[PDB]
Design a binder for this molecule. Structure first.
Ligand SMILES: Cc1cc(CCCOc2c(C)cc(-c3noc(C(F)(F)F)n3)cc2C)on1
Ligand SMILES: Cc1cc(CCCOc2c(C)cc(-c3noc(C(F)(F)F)n3)cc2C)on1
Ligand SMILES: N[C@@H](CCC(=O)N[C@@H](CS)C(=O)NCC(=O)O)C(=O)O
Ligand SMILES: N[C@@H](CCC(=O)N[C@@H](CS)C(=O)NCC(=O)O)C(=O)O
Lengths: 264, 237, 235, 235, 264, 237, 264
C-alpha cells in the first residue's frame, strides 16, 4: 500500500390505540430520526417537573376551507402560556424538552382532501420588505394563534411605519425551497379517505445540550393542504383542525427572577 | 544536503489535491462533539427519500401548488393517457428539481433502479383501476393502452389501496448513464392509462386529485462530481 | 464487482477548494484622499453561492478548514517607471483585538496574532484551521434572536436585534497589506481566497435553495418562478 | 543472452507525451468587440494525427490518462508599458455543468468543478485522470447511430443523427482564463496540452490509416495514391 | 533493486463434413480470435429462443463476373427480416448474438479465381460527399441485398438533393486502409482450384455485454475478388455466390411494443 | 525542516519520464472490465500476421487492386526472372506499407528471420515448377537462374501444392539492423525464376495470377521507438 | 557507509624451432594480447576448410636498401588470391579468421640494421588531397604487392584527375601519431646482430563475431627500418625480405554466387 507519515503535531494539519401522558389520554406514530426524547447524559441542579409539565395541552381550533393556504407554529413558543411549563420557562435561564404532536381532523366518507404536516428544525422564515432580517420579536413569536401562509409575495411598501412581519409563500415553504422536497423533514400525511389524525414524536435537537427557551425556538410545525377540500357538489365547506402538544423529558436550570417579554 | 531533483508539477495549485499544511492555531482545545439526531454519512441517503413530483407544469399552473396535482374524473376520455414522461431523472423538467434530481445535478454519471409512488386523494366511495407502464427505449413512445401493456406494467385498484408503487429496474447497455440529455443513453418512458373508469355514487364529488413521488433504491450510484446549473450569481456583496 | 458509493461520501462531496473572497490592495504614494493601501475582510462563506448552497443541504455541521491564497498583480499606468517584487502581509484579527487604522501602525507587529508573509511569484499560500466553534457544532440556521425586549425597558431599542443572527462579530477579520514602500508607479493586486472543508460531519438534512439568495438570511426578493413549462402528456 | 521484446509492449508503445491541443488566451482591456479573454476547448484526441493513428491500431481500448500543460507568453506592442507575472486558471466542465459567458462570471467559483491555478515561469502543470468510460471499454470505432427514424414520426428530422457518433457532448470541456486584470499593454499566451496513456489494454487490432484523415470519421477526400512507382524485376 | 513507494491514494496517480444447427444442415472452419459464442456469464429475465432463431438463413444469391469489384453486408442488419429473429429484435430493447457464416461458390476445374472473405468488427464506411458523417440510416442499413464496392471515388456533386450514400473503394477497403492488410481481420480464401466454400464462426464482440440491435451493427462481412474470374478463352463468365448465416447463443431483453423503422 | 540540495534537471519536463501526479477526480468508481475477444499484449504479435505484398508497382497498376497480382503464362521467357526485390522490410516500397513495415516504421532497429508465402491462383489443370531464391549481400544481384541457385533456394511444384513458404533466416554481422536504407546493414536479395514452364491443356486459360504474403517469426525484435513518416498534417481543426 | 537507493527502473539512469600447419612447415614467438585464435563460441551452418585454407602462403619478396622507408600490407586483403581461401572469401557473405605472420630477413655478421614489425587493428591511413576520406577502394586494397611509406607529405595538386591514393608518412606512422608509440601495438624487432626472423600470432579482433571479408580489413602489417642498413664501407647494400602468412581457425557463412570486385 501507499506510504504516509504525518509530520505536524496538529490533527487539522493532517491530510484528509390510546396514548397516556401524565393526567392526559388521547384515543401509526412517527418518531423523528428514530430517536426518542431523553434526559441529558452524565457527560447547578436542574429542575424537572415530572408530571406538572409533561402533559397534553390543546391549542385553539382552526378552520379548513376551500381557500385555506396553510398554518404554522413555533415551539416552544406556542406553549409559553400553558400551565406551569411557561412559568418554568420564564423563571429559568436554560431549558430543554422534547415534544409529542397530535393533529386531529375528522370528516365523512363523502369528503376528500389531504393535509401534510411537517416538523422542521430551525425553521427560519422570510420577511416582507427589502430590508434583510428586519422582522421583530413580537411578530416572530405569535404564540398559540400562530400564523398563515400566502399564495404570493406581498411586499410591504411603507417606509413610514414598516410592519416587520413574515411573508411566507406556500409553494416556497416560506424559506425559498420547493414544497415537494419538504418531505425530507419528518412528516405525516392525513388523507380523509384513510385516516383522521397524525402523530409525531420530536426529540431535542440543537447544537448545544441546553439553551434558552425564550430567545430561540427549536421546532417549527407546518400544516399545508396538498389537495383542496371538497364535499359533494357544495360551494362552501369548512371543517375544524385541532392540535395537541405534550412536552416530554423537560429540564430547566438557572433560577432567578421572572422574565416578562413585551408582546405588543 | 540531500540531493533532490524537482519534477514537473512543482509549485502548482490543484484544487483537488490532498496534502498537509501547517496549523496557524497550535495547541487549540477543540470543543468535544455530542450525539445529535439526524447524522448523514452519504449523499445517496438523501436520494432514497421520496419527494413529490411537479407533474403538471402547464403555463397557468407551474410555480404553484396545483402543479403537484393531477386531475382525475369519471367522465374522462378512457382512450387517452393520464400522464406521460421520460426516464431522465436529472434533465427532465418534471424530475430535475426533485431531491434526487438536485443531488444528481452535482454529478455526471448515474446508475441504478428507481421507485415511483402514486397516491389517490379521492373519497372512500370512489372506485376504479389504473395501469402504470414503463417502456424501455428503442421504439415509438406509447400512445395507447395496447402499446403500453406490452412493456412493464402494474395494475392498481383505487378502492382496495389508496397508494401504488412501481419499481423501474436498471436495464441498460452501458454501465453508467449521463445526467444530461443524450440519445445514446436514453432511459425509456413512463405512461399511465385507465384500465377501468372511476365510478362514484350520487352526492359524491366527480373530480379528484392524484399525487406522485419518486425515490432511489439501495443499488444506486453516482460518479464524477461537477457543479450544478441551478444556482448563479451576478454580483459580489 | 458491484458499483460503489465512494465518491458520494460527505468528505468526497466537500473535497474541493471554493473561492469565498476577492480582495483588492493597492501600492502607491499615500495621499489625503481615500486609498486601498490596506484591506480588511470579514470572514464568512456567504459572499459566494456555490459553497453556501452545498453547505446549506444540512442544518448542523462540524469540520476543520484549509485556506489557500492566490495573489495576482498588475500595473495601471505606463509613464511612471517600474517596480520591484512586493511582499504581502496577511494578519488574522480575532474579535476584541485592535484593528489597524493605517498601513504602518503598531498593530502590524503581530506579537500574538498569527500572520503570513507572502512573496510574489512563489507558490500560493496555504494554511489550516481547526474547529473553533463555541458550541458543539456550527449552526447554518438559527431561528431566534440575541436579545429579548422587556416590558420594563425604557425604550424599544434596548431589546432590538436582527432576526436569525447570533453575534455581531464572528470569527474575526483578515487584514491584508503590502509591506513594501511605494514605487513611483502605482501597482494593483488581487488576493483570492479558496476554502476547503476537511473532516466533515453533518446533521439534519435540508432541502436545497431553489431561488436566488438575497442577503445573509433566507429572504427572497426576485425570480420566484424557477420551473419551466411542459406538457402533461408530452414525453 | 537472447533478444527481448521489452520495448514493443503496449505500455512502452504508448509511454510518451503527445500534443493534442494548442489554445490561445489574451489579456487586454475588455471591449465591445470579440476577444479571447477566455477560451473553451472540447476534449478529444482527434485534433492531431500522430496519437490518433497510434490509437486507431485497435478497435477497443481501456486506459488512464496523464495530462501536462506548457504555457508560453509574449508581448504584442512596444509602446504601452510592461506587465507583472500572470496567473492562469484551468477549469474542467463536465457535461451538464454551467458554462462561462465572461471571464469573470460566477462559474469560476469552481465550488465542485476541479481547477488548476498555474503561475507563469514555474514547472509545467500536470495531473492524472482515471478511466471514466460509461461502458467497459472505450470505442474508437462505432458502426451505428444514436437515433432510429420511425414510420410514425411527424417529420424526418426527429430521428436524424450523425453516422458513427455516440453522444453530442463527451468528456466535457476545458475553460482557460487569465485571473489577473488587464495591464495597459496586451499580452498573448499559448497553452499546449500533452497527453500520455497509462495502464493500457487494447482489443481487436486494426490496420493503420493509409490516407490523410478528413474529419472525425473515416471519410477520405484527397491524396488517395500513397504508393510510389517501382520496377517488377528491379532490386 | 530500486526503491519505490506510492504516495497518493488513487491508482491513477501511480507511476506506470456436415454441420447441423436447429432444423438446418449444411454439407476447415475458422473461429474468430479462438473464442466460441457463449451466453452471458453470471456477472429482468432474458428471452432465448433456443431453436426458433438459432438456425441457418440463406440470403439472395449474387453473380460474380469479370467486372465485379466486391460485396459487403452488415450484421445483425442483414437478418432483420428472417423469421422470429427479426421479431425478437424489434420487440426488445437489448439483444446479443454470435454468428456462423458460410459462403458457397462452385465452379469447374477449368475455371480460375480467388475470393477473399473478411469479417470486420465495427466496420465503418466512408461517405460520398464533402460533408462528414452525413450518411443516412436507410442507406447505411441495406439489409439482405447489401452493397457493392467501387474502383474509384465518385463525389456526389449535388447540393440540391444529396444522396447521403456510402462510396467504398476496393483497394482502400472502403475505410481508408490498404486492402493487403485486411488479413489482420478474421478471413478466409476461396480458391477455385482447391475448395468451393468458406466458413467462419464469430463470437459477440462489443464494449458492452449487451446492446441494441437496431441502431448498432456489430459485424461486417466483405467479399472481394483477389484474382479475376476466367474460363477457357471465353469473353464473358458469370457464376453464383451464396451466403448462409446462422445465429448462435442469442439473448434478448427489454420487452415492449414493436419497433418499425422507416426504410424509405 | 529537512535540508535539501537541488540537482541539475529540476523543474524540467521530459516527455518520457515516469513520475507520480495528483488525481483530479478522487474516489471515482471505475467501471469493471469484461473479457473481450482479441486482446493484444505486444506489437510484435501484429507483425507475425501475414499480409499481401503489392509486388507490381508499375505506373498504371500502382494504387489499384492489380498491384497485388503477378502474372504467369505458358509463353513467358524462361531465361528472365519473374520478380525481384531487396530484403528491406521497412524501406523497400513493396514492403514498407505492409503491416510488418508499418510496425517497423515506428522503430529504429530490427532483427530476426522472415517468412514469405506465395499462392498460385490458376486452374487445377495447370502444372509447373518454380525456384524461389534468397542471396545474402556482398555480391552482384542475381540476374539468371545459374547465379540464383548458388544461394539459398526452394523448388515449388504448382500441381501438387498451390502455396509455398520460404523462411529467410537471420544472417548478419551486426546484432541489429537499421530500418532505413543503408549499405552497411543491407540484408540481401529475393528473386524468382522458372524451373520448368507452365503447361496447360486445351480449353484452359493460358494466363494466371500469383499472390504474395510476408510475416515475421517468433525470433523477431525491434528497438528505439520513433515517429513514422506515413502520416502528416498541415492545419489544425 | 553512505546510503544510496536507485529510483529509476533503467540501469542507465543509475549514478556511476619448427612450426607445422597443414601441409606447410617453417624452421621466440609473440601472441597478440595473449589470446590464441579460436572458433566462434556456442553463444545457417558455417563452412570450415580445416587444411585447404589453414596453411602458409608466401608473398612477393621485397628489397631493403639504404633509402627504403617502409612497407605495409592489409589483411585479409593480401590473401584474396591465395588458393581456396580467396574462393571461400568471394563465395560467402561472412568470414572470420586469425593469422600467423612470419617475417624472414637474413644477413651476415658484418651487416647492421634493425627492423620493426607492427600488427595494428583497424589500421586506417591518411589520404593525399584536401578532400577527406576520398581514397578509392582499388587504391586502398593493393593486395599482395602492398604499399610503401614516404618521408614527407606530397599533396596531389590535380583537380582534373585526382589520384585518390594514400600518402603515409614514416615518422607519423601514416595516421597522425608518433612512430615511437607504435610499440603499444603488438610488435617484434629484428636486429641483424641477434636474430633473422620474426613471428606474430593474431587472433580475430572486431566489434562483431563475424563480418564481411571483402569490404573490411581486420589487420594491418607495417615494417619499418628503425636503423639504416649498412655493410662494411660499401656505398650500396640490398637484401631481401620475405613474408609468409598462415590463416588459422577460419569460418565462412552465407553461400551465394561469386563476388568479382573491379580492381582497376
Ligand atoms: C461555519 C463557518 C466556519 C467559518 C470559518 C472559521 C475559520 O475562521 C478562520 C479563518 C478563515 C482564518 C483564520 C486564520 N488563522 O490564521 C490566519 C492567517 F495566518 F492567515 F492570518 N487566518 C482563523 C479562523 C478562525 O466560517 N463559517
Ligand atoms: C478515448 C478518450 C479518452 C479521452 C479523455 C478522457 C479524460 O478526459 C478528461 C480530461 C482530458 C481532463 C479532465 C480534468 N480533470 O481535471 C481537470 C483540470 F483540473 F485540469 F481542470 N481536467 C477530466 C477528464 C474526464 O478522450 N478520448
Ligand atoms: N465582472 C464583474 C464581476 C466580477 C466578479 O467578482 N465575479 C464573481 C461572481 S459575480 C466571481 O466569482 N468571479 C470569478 C472570479 O473572479 O474568481 C467585475 O469584474 O466586477
Ligand atoms: N504554422 C501554422 C501551423 C501551426 C500549428 O498549429 N501546427 C501544428 C500542426 S498543423 C502543430 O502541431 N505544430 C507544432 C506545435 O506548435 O506544437 C500556424 O502557425 O498557424
Amino acid at each position: 500500500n501507499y506510504t504516509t507519515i504525518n509530520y505536524y503535531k496538529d490533527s487539522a494539519s493532517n491530510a484528509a390505540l390510546q396514548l397516556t401522558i401524565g393526567n392526559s389520554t388521547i384515543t401509526n406514530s412517527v418518531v423523528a430520526y428514530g430517536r426518542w426524547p431523553e434526559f441529558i447524559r452524565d457527560d447547578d441542579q436542574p429542575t424537572e417537573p415530572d408530571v406538572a409539565t409533561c402533559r397534553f395541552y390543546t391549542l385553539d381550533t382552526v378552520m379548513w376551507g376551500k381557500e385555506s393556504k396553510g398554518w404554522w407554529w413555533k415551539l416552544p413558543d406556542a406553549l409559553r402560556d400553558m400551565g406551569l411549563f411557561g412559568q418554568n420557562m420564564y423563571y429559568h435561564y436554560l431549558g430543554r424538552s422534547g415534544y409529542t404532536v397530535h393533529v386531529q381532523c375528522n370528516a365523512s366518507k363523502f369528503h376528500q382532501g389531504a393535509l401534510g404536516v411537517f416538523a422542521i428544525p430551525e425553521y427560519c422564515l422570510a420577511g416582507d420588505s427589502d430590508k434583510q432580517r428586519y422582522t421583530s420579536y413580537a411578530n416572530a413569536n405569535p404564540g398559540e394563534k400562530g400564523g398563515k401562509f400566502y399564495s404570493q409575495f406581498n411586499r410591504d411598501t411603507a417606509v413610514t411605519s414598516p410592519k416587520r412581519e413574515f411573508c411566507p409563500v406556500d409553494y416556497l415553504l416560506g424559506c425559498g425551497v420547493l414544497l415537494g422536497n419538504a418531505f425530507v423533514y419528518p412528516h405525516q400525511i392525513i388523507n380523509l379517505r384513510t385516516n383522521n389524525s397524525a402523530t409525531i414524536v420530536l426529540p431535542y435537537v440543537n447544537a448545544m445540550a441546553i439553551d434558552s427557551m425564550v430567545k430561540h425556538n427549536n421546532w417549527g410545525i407546518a400544516i399545508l393542504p396538498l389537495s383542496p377540500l371538497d364535499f359533494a357538489q357544495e360551494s362552501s365547506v369548512e371543517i375544524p383542525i385541532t392540535v395537541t402538544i405534550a412536552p416530554m423529558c423537560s429540564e430547566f436550570n438557572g433560577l432567578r427572577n421572572v422574565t416578562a417579554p413585551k408582546f405588543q | 544536503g540531500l540531493p533532490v531533483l524537482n519534477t514537473p508539477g512543482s509549485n502548482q495549485y490543484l484544487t483537488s489535491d490532498n496534502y498537509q499544511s501547517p496549523c496557524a492555531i497550535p495547541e487549540f482545545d477543540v470543543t468535544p462533539p455530542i450525539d445529535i439526531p439526524g447524522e448523514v454519512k452519504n449523499m445517496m441517503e438523501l436520494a432514497e427519500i421520496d419527494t413529490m413530483i411537479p407533474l403538471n407544469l402547464e403555463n397557468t399552473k407551474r410555480n404553484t401548488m396545483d402543479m403537484y396535482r393531477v386531475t382525475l374524473s369519471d367522465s374522462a376520455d378512457l382512450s387517452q393517457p393520464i400522464l406521460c414522461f421520460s426516464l431522465s431523472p436529472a434533465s427532465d423538467p418534471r424530475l430535475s428539481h426533485t431531491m434526487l434530481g438536485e443531488v444528481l445535478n452535482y454529478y455526471t454519471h448515474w446508475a441504478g433502479s428507481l421507485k415511483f409512488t402514486f397516491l389517490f386523494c379521492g373519497s372512500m366511495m370512489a372506485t376504479g383501476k389504473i395501469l402504470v407502464a414503463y417502456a424501455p427505449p428503442g421504439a415509438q413512445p406509447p400512445t395507447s393502452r395496447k402499446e403500453a401493456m406490452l412493456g412493464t406494467h402494474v395494475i392498481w385498484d383505487l378502492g382496495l389501496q389508496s397508494s401504488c408503487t412501481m419499481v423501474v429496474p436498471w436495464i441498460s447497455n452501458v454501465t453508467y448513464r449521463q445526467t444530461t440529455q443524450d440519445s445514446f443513453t436514453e432511459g425509456g418512458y413512463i405512461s399511465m392509462f385507465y384500465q377501468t373508469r372511476i365510478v362514484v355514487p350520487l352526492s359524491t364529488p366527480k373530480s379528484m386529485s392524484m399525487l406522485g413521488f419518486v425515490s432511489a433504491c439501495n443499488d444506486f450510484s453516482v460518479r464524477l462530481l461537477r457543479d450544478t446549473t441551478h444556482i448563479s450569481q451576478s454580483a459580489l456583496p | 464487482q458491484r458499483r460503489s458509493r465512494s465518491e458520494s461520501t460527505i468528505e468526497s462531496f466537500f473535497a474541493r477548494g471554493a473561492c469565498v473572497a476577492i480582495i483588492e490592495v493597492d501600492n502607491e504614494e499615500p495621499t489625503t484622499r481615500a486609498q486601498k493601501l490596506f484591506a480588511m475582510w470579514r470572514i464568512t462563506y456567504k459572499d459566494t453561492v456555490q459553497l453556501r448552497r452545498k453547505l446549506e443541504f444540512f442544518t448542523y455541521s462540524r469540520f476543520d478548514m484549509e485556506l489557500t491564497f492566490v495573489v495576482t498583480a498588475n500595473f495601471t499606468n505606463t509613464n511612471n517607471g517600474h517596480a520591484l517584487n512586493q511582499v504581502y502581509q496577511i494578519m488574522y484579527i480575532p474579535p476584541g483585538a485592535p484593528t489597524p487604522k493605517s498601513w504602518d501602525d503598531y498593530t502590524w507587529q503581530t506579537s500574538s496574532n498569527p500572520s503570513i508573509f507572502y512573496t510574489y511569484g512563489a507558490a500560493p499560500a496555504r494554511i489550516s484551521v481547526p474547529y473553533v466553534g463555541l458550541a458543539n457544532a456550527y449552526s447554518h440556521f438559527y431561528d431566534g434572536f440575541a436579545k429579548v425586549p422587556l416590558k420594563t425597558d425604557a425604550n424599544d431599542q434596548i431589546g432590538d436585534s436582527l432576526y436569525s443572527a447570533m453575534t455581531v462579530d464572528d470569527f474575526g477579520v483578515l487584514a491584508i497589506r503590502v509591506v513594501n514602500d511605494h514605487n513611483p508607479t502605482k501597482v494593483t493586486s488581487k488576493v483570492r481566497i479558496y476554502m476547503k472543508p476537511k473532516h466533515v460531519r453533518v446533521w439534519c438534512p435540508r432541502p436545497p435553495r431553489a431561488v436566488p439568495y438575497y442577503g445573509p438570511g433566507v429572504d427572497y426578493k426576485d425570480n420566484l418562478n424557477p420551473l419551466s413549462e411542459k406538457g402533461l402528456t408530452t414525453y
